[PDB]
Amino acid sequence: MKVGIDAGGTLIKIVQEQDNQRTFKTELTKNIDQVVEWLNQQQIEKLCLTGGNAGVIAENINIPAQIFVEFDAASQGLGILLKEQGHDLADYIFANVGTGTSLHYFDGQSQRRVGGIGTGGGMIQGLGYLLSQITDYKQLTDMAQHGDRNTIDLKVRHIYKDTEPPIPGDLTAANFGHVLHHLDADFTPSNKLAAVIGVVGEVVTTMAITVAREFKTENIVYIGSSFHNNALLRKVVEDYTVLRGCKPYYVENGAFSGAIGALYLE
Amino acid sequence: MKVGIDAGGTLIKIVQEQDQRTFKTELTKNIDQVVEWLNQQQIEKLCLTGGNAGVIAENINIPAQIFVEFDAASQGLGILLKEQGHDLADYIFANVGTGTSLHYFDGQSQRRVGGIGTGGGMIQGLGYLLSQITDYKQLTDMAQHGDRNTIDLKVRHIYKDTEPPIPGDLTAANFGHVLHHLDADFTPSNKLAAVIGVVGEVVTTMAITVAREFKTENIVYIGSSFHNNALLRKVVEDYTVLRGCKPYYVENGAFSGAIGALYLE
Ligand SMILES: Nc1ncnc2c1ncn2[C@@H]1O[C@H](COP(=O)(O)OP(=O)(O)OP(=O)(O)O)[C@@H](O)[C@H]1O
Ligand SMILES: Nc1ncnc2c1ncn2[C@@H]1O[C@H](COP(=O)(O)OP(=O)(O)O)[C@@H](O)[C@H]1O
Ligand SMILES: CC(C)(C)[C@@H](O)C(=O)NCCC(=O)NCc1ccc2c(c1)OCO2
Numbered sequence: 001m002k003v004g005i006d007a008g009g010t011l012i013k014i015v016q017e018q019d020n021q022r023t024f025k026t027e028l029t030k031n032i033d034q035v036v037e038w039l040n041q042q043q044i045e046k047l048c049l050t051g052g053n054a055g056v057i058a059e060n061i062n063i064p065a066q067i068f069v070e071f072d073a074a075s076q077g078l079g080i081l082l083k084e085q086g087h088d089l090a091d092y093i094f095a096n097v098g099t100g101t102s103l104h105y106f107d108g109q110s111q112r113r114v115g116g117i118g119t120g121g122g123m124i125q126g127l128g129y130l131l132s133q134i135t136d137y138k139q140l141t142d143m144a145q146h147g148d149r150n151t152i153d154l155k156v157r158h159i160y161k162d163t164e165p166p167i168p169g170d171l172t173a174a175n176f177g178h179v180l181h182h183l184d185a186d187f188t189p190s191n192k193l194a195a196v197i198g199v200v201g202e203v204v205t206t207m208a209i210t211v212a213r214e215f216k217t218e219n220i221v222y223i224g225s226s227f228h229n230n231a232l233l234r235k236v237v238e239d240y241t242v243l244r245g246c247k248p249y250y251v252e253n254g255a256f257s258g259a260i261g262a263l264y265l266e
Numbered sequence: 267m268k269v270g271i272d273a274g275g276t277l278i279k280i281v282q283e284q285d286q287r288t289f290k291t292e293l294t295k296n297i298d299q300v301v302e303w304l305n306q307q308q309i310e311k312l313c314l315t316g317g318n319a320g321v322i323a324e325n326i327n328i329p330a331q332i333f334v335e336f337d338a339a340s341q342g343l344g345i346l347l348k349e350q351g352h353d354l355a356d357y358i359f360a361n362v363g364t365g366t367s368l369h370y371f372d373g374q375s376q377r378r379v380g381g382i383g384t385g386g387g388m389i390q391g392l393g394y395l396l397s398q399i400t401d402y403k404q405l406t407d408m409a410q411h412g413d414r415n416t417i418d419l420k421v422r423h424i425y426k427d428t429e430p431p432i433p434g435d436l437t438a439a440n441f442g443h444v445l446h447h448l449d450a451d452f453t454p455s456n457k458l459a460a461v462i463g464v465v466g467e468v469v470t471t472m473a474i475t476v477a478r479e480f481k482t483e484n485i486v487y488i489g490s491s492f493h494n495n496a497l498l499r500k501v502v503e504d505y506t507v508l509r510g511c512k513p514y515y516v517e518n519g520a521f522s523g524a525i526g527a528l529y530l531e
């Protein structure tokens with residue numbers, strides 16, 4: 001068997017290949033000791049590593065392992081998954097929405113990193129904690145789907161009132177920009193959490209359409225685990241990608257692009 | 267006298283000219299008292315811009331020309347840059363207000379090249395949610411000597427002891443260190459420093475991205491979001507220089523739109 005590991009800041013993504021059967025395992029980066037141990041109990045024909053914690057694994061296992069640069073590995077894996085699922089895209093932006101967010105332009109034969117921003121899943125978790133005292137990711141994300149942003153976010157029509165805006169009125173003018181018009185309010189943990197995800201999705205999508213235009217593609221492929229159990233984030237990103245005339249794509253097992261890629265760079 | 271007013275989401279910026287200009291600011295909140303002041307005054311020419319120009323116009327008892335904010339801001343900025351001894355053949359400008367709007371100026375005119383709702387309004391609102399402080403002077407002041415280190419995550423923190431493929435001192439995930447420091451103490455300074463951080467960083471990233479697209483090294487930052495907030499100016503200044511671009515701040519750049527309303531007329 002063959003194993004691929006993308007050991008990120010938050011999640012360790014593991015892909016095992018026997019015959020042609022794939023196994024897709026996720027594990028916490030916090031529990032990296034139990035990944036190293038599992039690995040040490042296994043019969044492995046080939047081990048390929050990538051991600052920020054790849055080296056922690058590599059220095060505590062009993063076998064050699066090839067190590068790849070995660071930008072390369074993610075592009076390779078995502079090419080594999082896009083093909084298999086029927087997407088045949090000449091070019092595209094891809095946005096790896098992980099703990100942080102990295103943005104890449106794939107021109108048809110290779111990738112180039114073209115931007116990055118620190119708004120991603122880490123912010124959802126961290127800023128989510130500070131506003132809700134919720135540490136559990138499922139709990140945090142589920143609760144945010146129950147939320148309404150309208151008392152928190154300020155729209156363009158709120159600013160332009162009864163006059164004609166220079167950009168459409170329903171757009172977000174200012175994330176958290178309505179909070180001070182609603183100080184009579186509670187600000188419920190759900191509402192606050194939807195606004196966090198709101199701001200994270202809008203920033204990511206904004207940067208992505210921006211570089212899409214810069215590199216003259218209209219296809220944007222979103223990946224990373226930040227979308228798992230977060231319909232809200234996936235909605236926010238999708239709607240605004242379409243609103244600005246780009247085509248968004250999500251891919252089955254998108255979050256393992258890295259782990260897959262590492263296997264097929266060997 | 268001639269009057270130019272940029273009535274924003276949060277602040278109303280007033281410029282009076284006799285001969286010689288006067289700069290004055292008031293809260294959008296208190297728009298009523300701006301209208302009262304316009305109504306008692308003899309004015310040769312009143313020019314309006316911004317989202318609340320309409321609210322002004324329909325409550326004043328005199329006529330008023332209304333100009334579009336992006337054109338006016340561009341025009342006033344050009345004027346202010348020149349008066350302050352700059353000759354930039356082109357530039358990005360980043361109007362950082364309640365929300366942020368980004369423009370490319372090619373030497374003759376401006377195009378909007380994007381925008382983002384991370385801006386002064388988010389500082390105020392998210393900073394209220396993290397701290398319960400509503401007074402702006404106070405909010406921005408608490409932030410100034412905060413420490414972001416237990417809150418933000420650097421690339422070096424993800425990459426541990428191996429060589430990262432981008433510089434390790436870079437922020438990797440805003441608020442991304444929070445869960446590794448659950449052992450109390452998120453203080454209001456550190457939290458507010460982190461809000462400013464994320465807003466400075468998002469704004470600048472957008473700015474330098476459009477600066478590359480449009481092939482200019484010059485980025486001019488305006489808006490009242492920089493008032494009483496050295497840390498926002500620092501965060502933005504440093505990341506811009508990091509990315510190869512030249513940052514510029516402009517004395518009274520918050521009044522760009524007000525000034526421009528007067529000289530499009
Ligand atoms: N079970 C989970 N526990 C914690 N976070 C989760 C979970 N499932 C999804 N997430 C989300 O996924 C995000 C991380 O996604 P991902 O696996 O792409 O990042 P990473 O590769 O660990 O980080 P990076 O590659 O930026 O170092 C988390 O911050 C969180 O928002
Ligand atoms: N005295 C103040 N009161 C409230 N907000 C202020 C003040 N001074 C600066 N600000 C900041 O500036 C922002 C407004 O920027 P501005 O350029 O005036 O935008 P707008 O045109 O939308 O009013 C506020 O969101 C706040 O962050
Ligand atoms: C694992 C990665 C680090 C590749 C991933 O999480 C990522 O790309 N994160 C975002 C990193 C980034 O590009 N940040 C942008 C940034 C923007 C502004 C900054 C800054 C950093 O440092 C200080 O000012």
Ligand SMILES: CC(C)(C)[C@@H](O)C(=O)NCCC(=O)NCc1ccc2c(c1)OCO2
Pocket residue numbers: 156159170171172173174202203205206240317363364365366367368380381382383
């Ligand atoms: C006064 C203005 C509205 C001109 C100024 O505050 C501004 O330009 N704000 C930002 C508007 C913007 O470009 N927003 C970006 C945005 C990004 C994502 C969005 C979205 C809007 O609506 C829903 O998803």
